[PDB]
Design an enzyme around this catalytic site. Structure first.
Site, short mmCIF file in Angstrom:
data_model
loop_
_atom_site.label_atom_id
_atom_site.label_comp_id
_atom_site.label_asym_id
_atom_site.label_seq_id
_atom_site.Cartn_x
_atom_site.Cartn_y
_atom_site.Cartn_z
N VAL A 178 0.82 -1.20 0.00
CA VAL A 178 0.00 0.00 0.00
C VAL A 178 0.86 1.25 0.00
O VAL A 178 1.94 1.25 0.58
CB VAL A 178 -0.86 0.04 1.26
CG1 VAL A 178 -2.01 1.04 1.09
CG2 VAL A 178 -1.37 -1.32 1.57
N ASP B 61 -12.28 -12.82 11.34
CA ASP B 61 -10.82 -12.62 11.43
C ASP B 61 -10.42 -11.17 11.68
O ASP B 61 -9.36 -10.70 11.23
CB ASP B 61 -10.12 -13.17 10.20
CG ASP B 61 -8.64 -13.51 10.45
OD1 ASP B 61 -8.16 -13.64 11.61
OD2 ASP B 61 -7.93 -13.68 9.43
#
Ligand SMILES: O=C1/C(=N\O)c2c(/C=C/c3ccccc3)cccc2N1Cc1cc(F)cc2c1OCOC2
Length: 336
Positions: free
Chosen positions: A28, A139
């Protein structure tokens, strides 16, 4: 040409000209968007179609990021590929608003109760939106959660085979023991996060699911008989023959030491935070508090807003393909 390329550390970034001065933040980049005139985060997926795990997640995350609308879940500002055809098709770039930090960094801070509970309030709002849409995350972890200076927070992903190159500290016992779950599987993860905020150490670290379960009962104690009963013989066997633990109570698990508790206000809040922790960090999901009640909790309910809690759920996967079918599916999505 609408695109240009620059190297970032190990990777080439080939993005639209509007995005500039890219900086690594995770793969990113932060960048300045000249058209919107603000900063954004840009995620690069290389060949997300390279295998079914990658492909399923990239595809899933694409469909969702785009039809889910709530301030606590990431929203996409833009999606593109530089490649011009399905044959040339290689990468996907996702663009979203930029915040200021991961939850891991916040976690390393001493936080007042007003910030700690607002954070947790937001996680729960986010999780609640997901569930209303049929999405149980399963998660949640700090690395997929981001925060802005003003304490606002977004969840970056939508949760749960083999790969050739992942953190499970936050996964519920019903996930670890692989045993069927409902919406409150996610409350467990919020609890590990909350707990980690306070104790500043990961609650249940483990090299793998064996360790991990050992770390869980070391502190919370063996689960009751009724819980065992819903375990597969194979799993149940292994779980009932693990060495037993009474369990530690919560005042012991999170001593007064760990809590801002110098004013009366801070002393009452400490009591309230520990009460909520004790309701979330519960092995038996049949006894674990749900999302709606956690939002009703005195620690949390000071932030409660019907607009943020009770928002229209998104209209909306669970599937399997080859490399080539995944590739076209994703290309179709990227193109619309
Ligand atoms: O805010 C984000 C963010 N997206 O907004 C962010 C992302 C965005 C991921 C993403 C996922 C799906 C689609 C688009 C982007 C990934 C990692 C960290 C993020 N951070 C935290 C962050 C922001 C900064 F300005 C600087 C740093 C930050 O964290 C580490 O320290 C440096």
């Amino acid at each position: 040409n609408q695109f240009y390329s620059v190297e970032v550390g190990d990777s080439t970034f080939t993005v639209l000209k509007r995005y500039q001065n890219l900086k690594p933040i995770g793969i990113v980049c932060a960048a300045y968007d000249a058209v919107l005139d603000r900063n954004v985060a840009i995620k690069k997926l290389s060949r997300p179609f390279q295998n079914q795990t990658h492909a399923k997640r990239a595809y899933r995350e694409l469909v969702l990021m785009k039809c889910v609308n709530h301030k606590n879940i990431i929203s996409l500002l833009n999606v593109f590929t530089p490649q011009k055809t399905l044959e040339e098709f290689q990468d996907v770039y996702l663009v979203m608003e930029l915040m200021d930090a991961n939850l891991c960094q916040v976690i390393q801070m001493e936080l007042d109760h007003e910030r700690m509970s607002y954070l947790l309030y937001q996680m729960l709002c986010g999780i609640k939106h997901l569930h209303s849409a049929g999405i149980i995350h399963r998660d949640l972890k700090p690395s997929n959660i981001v925060v802005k200076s003003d304490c606002t927070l977004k969840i970056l992903d939508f949760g749960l085979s083999f790969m050739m190159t992942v953190t499970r500290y936050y996964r519920a016992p019903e996930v670890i023991l692989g045993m069927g779950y409902k919406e409150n599987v996610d409350i467990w993860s919020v609890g590990c996060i909350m707990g980690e905020m306070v104790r500043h150490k990961i609650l249940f670290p483990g090299r793998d699911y064996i360790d991990q379960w050992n770390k869980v009962i070391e502190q919370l104690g063996t689960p009751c008989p009724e819980f065992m009963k819903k375990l597969q013989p194979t799993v149940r066997n292994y779980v009932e023959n693990r060495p037993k633990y009474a369990g530690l109570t919560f005042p012991k698990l999170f001593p007064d030491s760990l809590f801002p508790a110098d004013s009366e206000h801070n002393k009452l809040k400490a009591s309230q935070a520990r009460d909520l922790l004790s309701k979330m960090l519960v092995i038996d999901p049949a006894k674990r508090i749900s999302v709606d009640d956690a939002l009703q909790h005195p620690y949390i309910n000071v932030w409660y807003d019907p607009a943020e809690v009770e928002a229209p759920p998104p209209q909306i996967d669970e599937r399997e393909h080859t490399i080539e079918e995944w590739k076209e599916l994703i290309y179709k999505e990227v193109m619309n």
